[PDB]
Amino acid sequence: QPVVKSLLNSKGIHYNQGNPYNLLTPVIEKVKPGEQSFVGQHAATGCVATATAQIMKYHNYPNKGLKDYTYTLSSNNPYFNHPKNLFAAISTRQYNWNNILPTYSGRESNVQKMAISELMADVGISVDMDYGPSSGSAGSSRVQRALKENFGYNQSVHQINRSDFSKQDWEAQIDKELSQNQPVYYQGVGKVGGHAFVIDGADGRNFYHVNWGWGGVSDGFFRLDALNPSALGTGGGAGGFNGYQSAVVGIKPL
């Protein structure tokens, strides 16, 4: 396994799901029975959106969005009045990658905060995000489609499922992406929830560097069969994201 130093760390890229990344997600309207109120808060961006946005920042691409996206929230979502439709005018976007900074710690301008929030909101909408205090998406299948169809990434973008490969061939595909300086979108499912994140390096020990999308919390080296962060961020469930794994690879511009 080749050694590859964290690609996102090399560019200072560290995003999260809360402020100032979620300034344009939907504002929660209702209390879920049995849960404290999040009414008036912006919904989390969603791990799928944060992972994808970090990879897009790595490429500073696209300058122009290609195609709008619309969907309707599930009426099972207890946080919103229904029906609730969401629309992202991605075909009108001039993404300014000088305003979409690699990370945010507070002193950025409002224009800069709104730039990342707009990207986060657009990406989340493109993957049919189920918005809430935590926000969930089907992930890979929607990410690969959105990257190509909405955001103009290369036709090399595609989902791979862990079940379709031996351990060797799976890990070889991840290594190949890293050798091409291409961070990988990755997700898995644990006992009480799944999560999506970025694989962006390797240590030669059969461990991979993971950026969990929690602003840095728990980032480090993990085996792909022990994706078990200690400290958990928003949407972290009970960790241990070792089941039903998939990835989106080939992520690079047209």
Side-chain angles (χ1 to χ4, degrees), residues 1-4 6-190 192-222 224-254:
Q1 181 205 44
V3 177
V4 176
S6 169
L7 297 170
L8 297 179
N9 290 1
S10 77
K11 295 199 182 173
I13 296 166
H14 306 280
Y15 291 164
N16 205 339
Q17 293 194 45
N19 64 292
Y21 303 100
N22 71 340
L23 306 180
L24 290 169
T25 63
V27 173
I28 291 168
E29 299 169 359
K30 304 189 304 174
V31 181
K32 175 181 170 189
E35 185 178 62
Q36 70 187 50
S37 177
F38 293 77
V39 174
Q41 297 190 27
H42 289 272
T45 59
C47 62
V48 171
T50 294
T52 299
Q54 287 188 122
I55 298 175
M56 294 173 72
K57 176 58 185 171
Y58 187 86
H59 298 282
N60 290 302
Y61 185 88
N63 282 333
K64 167 83 163 47
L66 293 191
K67 180 167 169 62
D68 299 346
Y69 196 87
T70 302
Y71 73 111
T72 299
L73 292 184
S74 172
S75 62
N76 296 323
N77 182 310
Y79 298 110
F80 295 94
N81 295 280
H82 296 289
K84 179 104 173 141
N85 308 312
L86 299 173
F87 170 68
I90 292 160
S91 74
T92 76
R93 293 282 187 262
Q94 295 288 347
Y95 293 116
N96 185 333
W97 293 99
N98 303 120
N99 290 340
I100 304 166
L101 302 177
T103 195
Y104 289 75
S105 62
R107 291 211 191 194
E108 301 79 23
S109 72
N110 291 329
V111 163
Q112 292 162 343
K113 293 178 179 179
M114 288 300 177
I116 185 57
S117 281
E118 176 176 62
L119 177 70
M120 288 285 187
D122 289 347
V123 172
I125 286 166
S126 79
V127 301
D128 297 63
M129 191 65 70
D130 182 53
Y131 281 110
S134 65
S135 298
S137 166
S140 298
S141 54
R142 301 210 183 271
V143 168
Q144 61 85 32
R145 180 212 63 73
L147 282 171
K148 288 177 287 192
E149 297 188 11
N150 304 100
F151 300 111
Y153 278 70
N154 202 288
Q155 289 292 302
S156 59
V157 168
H158 66 283
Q159 171 177 359
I160 53 172
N161 289 326
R162 176 68 181 83
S163 55
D164 285 319
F165 298 96
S166 67
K167 184 173 215 276
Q168 170 175 48
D169 290 346
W170 180 250
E171 292 180 354
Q173 287 183 82
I174 307 301
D175 293 344
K176 180 64 168 145
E177 295 301 303
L178 299 179
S179 82
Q180 294 179 13
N181 296 312
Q182 289 170 188
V184 174
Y185 168 96
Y186 204 106
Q187 67 185 50
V189 181
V192 305
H195 186 59
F197 41 91
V198 180
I199 304 301
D200 72 338
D203 68 359
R205 300 168 54 248
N206 299 322
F207 288 65
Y208 288 89
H209 190 268
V210 182
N211 181 317
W212 300 105
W214 294 322
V217 174
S218 295
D219 287 5
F221 285 93
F222 297 82
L224 300 182
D225 60 359
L227 291 170
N228 287 58
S230 190
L232 303 176
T234 300
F241 308 117
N242 297 315
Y244 302 102
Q245 297 185 342
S246 62
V248 177
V249 297
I251 304 170
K252 64 182 174 183
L254 269 170

mmCIF file of all heavy atoms in Angstrom, residues 190-206, unseen atoms left out:
data_model
loop_
_atom_site.group_PDB
_atom_site.id
_atom_site.type_symbol
_atom_site.label_atom_id
_atom_site.label_comp_id
_atom_site.label_asym_id
_atom_site.label_seq_id
_atom_site.Cartn_x
_atom_site.Cartn_y
_atom_site.Cartn_z
ATOM 1 N N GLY A 190 -23.210 1.521 10.385
ATOM 2 C CA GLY A 190 -22.978 0.823 11.633
ATOM 3 C C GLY A 190 -24.275 0.352 12.237
ATOM 4 O O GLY A 190 -25.315 0.393 11.585
ATOM 5 N N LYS A 191 -24.206 -0.079 13.494
ATOM 6 C CA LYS A 191 -25.333 -0.732 14.153
ATOM 7 C C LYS A 191 -26.526 0.191 14.277
ATOM 8 O O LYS A 191 -27.679 -0.246 14.196
ATOM 9 C CB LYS A 191 -24.929 -1.223 15.550
ATOM 10 N N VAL A 192 -26.259 1.470 14.493
ATOM 11 C CA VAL A 192 -27.341 2.411 14.732
ATOM 12 C C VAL A 192 -27.090 3.684 13.944
ATOM 13 O O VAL A 192 -27.191 4.791 14.473
ATOM 14 C CB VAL A 192 -27.508 2.722 16.237
ATOM 15 C CG1 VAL A 192 -27.704 1.429 17.033
ATOM 16 C CG2 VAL A 192 -26.309 3.492 16.768
ATOM 17 N N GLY A 193 -26.747 3.515 12.672
ATOM 18 C CA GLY A 193 -26.613 4.637 11.770
ATOM 19 C C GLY A 193 -25.400 4.565 10.875
ATOM 20 O O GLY A 193 -24.385 3.947 11.212
ATOM 21 N N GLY A 194 -25.513 5.201 9.717
ATOM 22 C CA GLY A 194 -24.396 5.329 8.799
ATOM 23 C C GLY A 194 -23.845 6.739 8.694
ATOM 24 O O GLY A 194 -24.380 7.685 9.265
ATOM 25 N N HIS A 195 -22.766 6.872 7.935
ATOM 26 C CA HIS A 195 -22.042 8.125 7.830
ATOM 27 C C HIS A 195 -21.241 8.083 6.534
ATOM 28 O O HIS A 195 -20.891 7.020 6.023
ATOM 29 C CB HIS A 195 -21.149 8.314 9.073
ATOM 30 C CG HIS A 195 -20.462 9.638 9.145
ATOM 31 N ND1 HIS A 195 -21.138 10.839 9.161
ATOM 32 C CD2 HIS A 195 -19.145 9.939 9.204
ATOM 33 C CE1 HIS A 195 -20.256 11.822 9.235
ATOM 34 N NE2 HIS A 195 -19.040 11.300 9.250
ATOM 35 N N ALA A 196 -20.962 9.260 6.019
ATOM 36 C CA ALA A 196 -20.186 9.474 4.813
ATOM 37 C C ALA A 196 -19.037 10.407 5.140
ATOM 38 O O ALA A 196 -19.136 11.253 6.051
ATOM 39 C CB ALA A 196 -21.042 10.057 3.704
ATOM 40 N N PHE A 197 -17.942 10.241 4.413
ATOM 41 C CA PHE A 197 -16.685 10.854 4.782
ATOM 42 C C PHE A 197 -15.738 10.784 3.579
ATOM 43 O O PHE A 197 -16.131 10.348 2.489
ATOM 44 C CB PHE A 197 -16.113 10.178 6.048
ATOM 45 C CG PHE A 197 -16.273 8.680 6.054
ATOM 46 C CD1 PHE A 197 -15.285 7.851 5.542
ATOM 47 C CD2 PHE A 197 -17.429 8.107 6.568
ATOM 48 C CE1 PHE A 197 -15.456 6.464 5.561
ATOM 49 C CE2 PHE A 197 -17.611 6.740 6.563
ATOM 50 C CZ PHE A 197 -16.624 5.928 6.065
ATOM 51 N N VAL A 198 -14.502 11.247 3.754
ATOM 52 C CA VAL A 198 -13.528 11.309 2.674
ATOM 53 C C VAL A 198 -12.301 10.494 3.056
ATOM 54 O O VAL A 198 -11.774 10.625 4.169
ATOM 55 C CB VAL A 198 -13.104 12.767 2.383
ATOM 56 C CG1 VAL A 198 -12.091 12.804 1.252
ATOM 57 C CG2 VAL A 198 -14.312 13.655 2.035
ATOM 58 N N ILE A 199 -11.860 9.639 2.134
ATOM 59 C CA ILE A 199 -10.574 8.981 2.244
ATOM 60 C C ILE A 199 -9.578 9.772 1.407
ATOM 61 O O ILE A 199 -9.794 9.965 0.210
ATOM 62 C CB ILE A 199 -10.613 7.531 1.739
ATOM 63 C CG1 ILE A 199 -11.684 6.708 2.470
ATOM 64 C CG2 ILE A 199 -9.210 6.928 1.795
ATOM 65 C CD1 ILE A 199 -11.527 6.618 3.931
ATOM 66 N N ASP A 200 -8.478 10.215 2.025
ATOM 67 C CA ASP A 200 -7.560 11.119 1.342
ATOM 68 C C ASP A 200 -6.096 10.846 1.640
ATOM 69 O O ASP A 200 -5.265 11.687 1.383
ATOM 70 C CB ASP A 200 -7.904 12.578 1.655
ATOM 71 C CG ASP A 200 -7.559 12.969 3.071
ATOM 72 O OD1 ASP A 200 -7.447 12.060 3.920
ATOM 73 O OD2 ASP A 200 -7.406 14.187 3.335
ATOM 74 N N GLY A 201 -5.761 9.663 2.137
ATOM 75 C CA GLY A 201 -4.366 9.336 2.355
ATOM 76 C C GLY A 201 -4.232 7.911 2.834
ATOM 77 O O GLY A 201 -5.233 7.212 2.997
ATOM 78 N N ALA A 202 -2.993 7.480 3.052
ATOM 79 C CA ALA A 202 -2.691 6.096 3.423
ATOM 80 C C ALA A 202 -1.323 6.055 4.085
ATOM 81 O O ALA A 202 -0.443 6.840 3.727
ATOM 82 C CB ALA A 202 -2.692 5.217 2.196
ATOM 83 N N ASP A 203 -1.139 5.140 5.037
ATOM 84 C CA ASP A 203 0.099 5.120 5.833
ATOM 85 C C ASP A 203 1.031 3.946 5.563
ATOM 86 O O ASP A 203 2.066 3.830 6.218
ATOM 87 C CB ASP A 203 -0.203 5.186 7.338
ATOM 88 C CG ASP A 203 -0.882 3.934 7.872
ATOM 89 O OD1 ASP A 203 -1.149 2.985 7.086
ATOM 90 O OD2 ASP A 203 -1.178 3.927 9.090
ATOM 91 N N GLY A 204 0.686 3.107 4.591
ATOM 92 C CA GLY A 204 1.484 1.931 4.274
ATOM 93 C C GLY A 204 1.267 0.734 5.192
ATOM 94 O O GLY A 204 1.878 -0.317 4.997
ATOM 95 N N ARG A 205 0.400 0.899 6.190
ATOM 96 C CA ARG A 205 0.093 -0.160 7.145
ATOM 97 C C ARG A 205 -1.246 -0.818 6.827
ATOM 98 O O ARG A 205 -1.761 -1.561 7.647
ATOM 99 C CB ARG A 205 0.030 0.405 8.582
ATOM 100 C CG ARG A 205 1.305 1.055 9.063
ATOM 101 C CD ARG A 205 1.101 1.848 10.342
ATOM 102 N NE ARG A 205 0.487 1.072 11.418
ATOM 103 C CZ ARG A 205 -0.734 1.266 11.911
ATOM 104 N NH1 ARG A 205 -1.517 2.228 11.452
ATOM 105 N NH2 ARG A 205 -1.172 0.489 12.892
ATOM 106 N N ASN A 206 -1.819 -0.534 5.653
ATOM 107 C CA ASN A 206 -3.199 -0.912 5.305
ATOM 108 C C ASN A 206 -4.257 -0.087 6.070
ATOM 109 O O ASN A 206 -5.418 -0.482 6.195
ATOM 110 C CB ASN A 206 -3.423 -2.420 5.438
ATOM 111 C CG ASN A 206 -2.527 -3.225 4.501
ATOM 112 O OD1 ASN A 206 -2.272 -2.829 3.356
ATOM 113 N ND2 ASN A 206 -2.033 -4.358 4.990
#
